[PDB]
Design a protein around this ligand. Structure first.
Ligand code: ZN
Ligand code: ZN
Ligand code: ZN
Length: 178
């Protein structure tokens, strides 16, 4: 196994996957690494298993259909994985914890949102459809873009949103388009 966490790239108290060489800190893995379970498979392995059991799941889908799916176990897992993929980018540190807004010439968003809040929401099964999760994730970046206006710091929102969107397309097998 790897000697650094797959999500944060640091050493520490790591849990090793039994079916791939990845490792995780306890709260870096989503869901948090499970108490017992021997063997244990990580979220990357569990997502690969879904794909292997249903190869047709990789044919193209329409986003509108994906957003209306109910959050049954497999869609719950896919949202957890997609959240994990955003945390894997180091620039996610800007969007992880609860923000605050006091900048000359800007007003804070009406509905602040951050990655830890989405993490808790998923953990507490607060989303009933994929749409709920996706709307909150997109809100994070939209709030950022709107608040930082012309400051070049707005680009962080663009960059992390691009990571989100690419992984969303991959994980939910959205039909490729030009
Ligand atoms: Zn970590
Ligand atoms: Zn694994
Ligand atoms: Zn099948």
């Amino acid at each position: 196994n790897s000697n650094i966490c797959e999500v944060c790239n640091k050493w520490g108290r790591l849990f090793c996957c039994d079916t791939c060489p990845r490792s995780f800190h306890e709260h870096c893995h989503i869901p948090s690494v499970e108490a017992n379970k021997n063997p244990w498979s990580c979220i990357f392995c569990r997502i690969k298993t879904i794909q292997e059991r249903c190869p047709e799941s990789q044919s193209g889908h329409q986003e509108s259909e994906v957003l209306m799916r109910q959050m049954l176990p497999e869609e719950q897992l896919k949202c957890e994985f997609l959240l994990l993929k955003v945390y894997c980018d180091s620039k996610s540190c800007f969007f992880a914890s609860e923000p605050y807004y006091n900048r000359e010439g800007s007003q804070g968003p009406q509905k602040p949102m951050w990655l830890n809040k989405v993490k808790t929401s998923l953990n507490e099964q607060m989303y009933t459809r994929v749409e709920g999760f996706v709307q909150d994730m997109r809100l994070i970046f939209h709030n950022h873009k709107e608040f930082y206006r012309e400051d070049k710091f707005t680009r962080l929102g663009i960059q992390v949103q691009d990571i989100f969107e690419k992984n969303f397309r991959n994980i939910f097998a959205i039909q490729e388009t030009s």
